[PDB]
Design a protein around this ligand. Sequence first.
Ligand SMILES: CCCC[S@@](=N)(=O)CC[C@H](N)C(=O)O
Ligand SMILES: CCCC[S@@](=N)(=O)CC[C@H](N)C(=O)O
Ligand SMILES: [Mg+2]
Ligand SMILES: [Mg+2]
Lengths: 438, 436
Amino acid sequence: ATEPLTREDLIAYLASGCKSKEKWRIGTEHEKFGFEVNTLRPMKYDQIAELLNSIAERFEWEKVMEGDKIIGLKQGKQSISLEPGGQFELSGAPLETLHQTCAEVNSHLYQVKAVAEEMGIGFLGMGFQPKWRREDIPTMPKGRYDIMRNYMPKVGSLGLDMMLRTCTVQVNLDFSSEADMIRKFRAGLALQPIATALFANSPFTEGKPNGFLSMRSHIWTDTDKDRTGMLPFVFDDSFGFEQYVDYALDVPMYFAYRNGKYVDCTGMTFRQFLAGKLPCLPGELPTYNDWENHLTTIFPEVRLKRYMEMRGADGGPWRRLCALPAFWVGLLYDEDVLQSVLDLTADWTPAEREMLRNKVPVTGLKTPFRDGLLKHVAEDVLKLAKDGLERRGYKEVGFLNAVTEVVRTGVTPAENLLEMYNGEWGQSVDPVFQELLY
Amino acid sequence: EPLTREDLIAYLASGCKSKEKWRIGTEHEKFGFEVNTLRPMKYDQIAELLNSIAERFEWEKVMEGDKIIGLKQGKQSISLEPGGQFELSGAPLETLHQTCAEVNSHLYQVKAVAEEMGIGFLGMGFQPKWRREDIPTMPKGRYDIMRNYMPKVGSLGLDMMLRTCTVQVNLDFSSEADMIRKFRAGLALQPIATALFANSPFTEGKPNGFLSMRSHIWTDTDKDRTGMLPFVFDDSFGFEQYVDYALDVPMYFAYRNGKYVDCTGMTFRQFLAGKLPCLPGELPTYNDWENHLTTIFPEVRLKRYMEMRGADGGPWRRLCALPAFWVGLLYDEDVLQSVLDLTADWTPAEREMLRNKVPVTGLKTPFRDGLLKHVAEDVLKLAKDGLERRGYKEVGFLNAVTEVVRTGVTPAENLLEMYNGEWGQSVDPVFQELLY
Ligand SMILES: CCCC[S@@](=N)(=O)CC[C@H](N)C(=O)O
Ligand SMILES: CCCC[S@@](=N)(=O)CC[C@H](N)C(=O)O
Ligand SMILES: [Mg+2]
Ligand SMILES: [Mg+2]
């Protein structure tokens, strides 16, 4: 039946994510670099397809196909997918506690290694591929990524590196109202540079130090200015679901999915789409699934759909995969901690937030901020996050042990790798493929 | 109608299932210890561990009185052995991929709680450091009855109870004929499994002169309920003959009114007639019969399924190998025949000798004009054939025993080599080496 969507419907779609506190869940996604253990070469698509087929067969996953190509797996509310450079991704189910989150991570790592060991394949938990050049990375046989690869050079010089050479750990979290959403969004944006610093894990490029602690985070500043960043309008009095929808309506599209394929709609807006005026699909009107797809092509430091996504942290070893969601659950899921965070960050200017975002990639917790170091803010933030987890009552506070020494010493994971590179590793990155081996 | 002997025979036979319904059930036990002192984990620490696991990972609590003694989730159980050994009895699973993932899930949950408590778990067949009197005892009425009985029937049964760990597998049969064949293959080959998995060379911080002290212990526990069951190889053998055997094995206890009554020195035959002094006039249920069948401890046991009992506890890759070994041998009809062919002319005296000698000499046990190693070479290739033919790509689960069979050197001998070299003649490093 033909019943066109309006902007008002798009607003209501986001708002439809509201849920009461007792239904709030924790969704965790992470990406990993696969490599051949003996050559350290990136895992190619033929090896990826064997890995996926074996996982499906052994562990009962449904195969996700694009044409005649396996590109992912599905089992209940979990998915395994591929990033543009073959980075191997788990999107976990919405879970109630971080004990469940970490068991989900462990189950995945067991299944992957159970198959990959016989194949001579290992997985690396870092934010940026430390050894190989961009043109050494295999590309995935996915139509949507072909469109994106062709567009990236038009809007930045590092977007192809984002696609091919970066890995993240992220957390998805729920809101209960527009007021709650706004508060969470503001807390999440303001504190995102702190997450980035604590999880900074990408100091190598092409076998050498790149001069950054999170090269991955820097990459996101020269990807696409239209769909990235610290979203200053979120801190405007006017902000709400409607202001986010207008933002998103004017972010240019990548594609529209019709008839089993991705149509290139670059340079066009979802506005045009709503009015049936897309030159890629002329006269065609969008569905809620089109809107959801479009929403998934926007890449700010925190993203809004029917839930909220914290996107600032580098991939890392398993204890840090469990720490990242713990960090945000502690801060955002306790009302008093959330208020404390808003209080702490209340007087930070847009230029200050933007400065932290840009400088943290280089200096981490030693980034100057006001009359001290970001480290001192991270101290306060970490104690607050542990307060939040204590009060949840589920005994989850131990999941923050993995970042306690970072905060305490002010020394990022990336600086620990640098120290090994310059010492015991004899200035080769090759030992990182054992050090950060899953 | 009171149960009769014919009902007891039919109980066992009711386990028969068609090949498409055959499953794999895996149980293993681990020693818990304090990481810093190496001391055995005490009941108060076990109770905290079980309560935390239940709460985090959604397990139902199993209580004896006001004491938590285990957990239940679906068809899986976690229980305690008499010395606090921490046991998983897994679900009936279709493939060994599922088996090993089951093992991994358990190890993760246990370690997720135990790390914060300063507790580790050791995968060995015999407690390598501590004396019998050093081992905490579990607050479980059935084990109190057993502890009091053991000294009457052997000198090492208390060590069985307090200081041993096993990995075992439960498997199904489709008919009486199939049960008989699997029982015979299981019993004949059990000393080979014992040698491959031999992992108990230390007692009280020193070499004890064995490769599997655990296996040896089972030779001086109780002669009435252990061993290689030679009657299984008689022409007469079937469900009926096993029932008679079990009816004549003395009882341990009967469970009534929320407790265990001491029925030692009494027989299930008396029970059937209502003449058990411990429960006078009472007649048995099928649950009573099950409980009784669970107090019989031969190298292979029969209930409504079959249980392979010969292998020492070990690290995780060997927990996955033990079920694979028997699945390869018993769940392929051609391999099963090839095993019965290979063992056809073994005498009762030969089988008995191998069972008693393997604990000392392992795969270097002399057998006829060579070594048990040479038989294990043939048996391993056959077990791999069976797994290849299953079509589930499970053969890799035997990689963990391939070098043992190749070199003829048991895991226990590898530990001894470390003890005599890098460890500097202390067992304390084994608590890192075989740490889960
Ligand atoms: C293909 C680009 C969109 C997918 S993403 N936003 O999940 C990529 C995350 C990137 N690999 C990172 O490390 O942030
Ligand atoms: C309490 C003794 C009967 C239970 S058992 N057969 O499961 C003990 C197994 C023992 N822990 C071993 O390693 O053989
Ligand atoms: Mg991703
Ligand atoms: Mg047991």
